[PDB]
Design a protein around this nucleic acid. Structure first.
Ligand SMILES: [Zn+2]
Ligand SMILES: [Zn+2]
Ligand SMILES: [Zn+2]
Length: 89
DNA sequence: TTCTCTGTTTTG
DNA sequence: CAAAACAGAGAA
């Protein structure tokens, strides 16, 4: 059940197909590029590029819906943290 | 505190 | 199913 053979990893995964995608963690290729002009950042994961672009645009797309909370967040993990701490949503 | 990562879940 | 997103971890 999908064990990574690489030395000092040995993680096990929910699926074989992820086990293969996971291998990009053990290579130094960074195939994704930031589209913002001049920025040299590169990525391995598409979500990482997505969140990163918000650093350029300044957006805060995560908007707490709890009545009268009004807080907003740039990064998904920070919105998750707020939910977990407050019980909002 | 801001932000990148990544294993898993959700969406289409 | 593949793509998009989430949730939590945690580097800096
Ligand atoms: Zn591995
Ligand atoms: Zn960039
Ligand atoms: Zn809230």
């Amino acid at each position: 059940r999908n064990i990574c053979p690489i030395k000092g990893c040995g993680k096990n995964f929910f699926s074989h197909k992820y086990l293969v995608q996971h291998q990009r963690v053990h290579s130094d290729d960074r195939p994704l590029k930031c589209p913002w002009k001049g920025c040299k950042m590169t990525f391995k994961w598409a979500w990482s590029r997505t969140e990163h672009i918000r650093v350029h645009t300044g957006a805060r797309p995560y908007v707490c819906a709890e009545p009268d909370c009004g807080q907003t967040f740039r990064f998904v993990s920070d919105f998750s943290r707020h939910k977990r701490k407050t019980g909002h949503s």
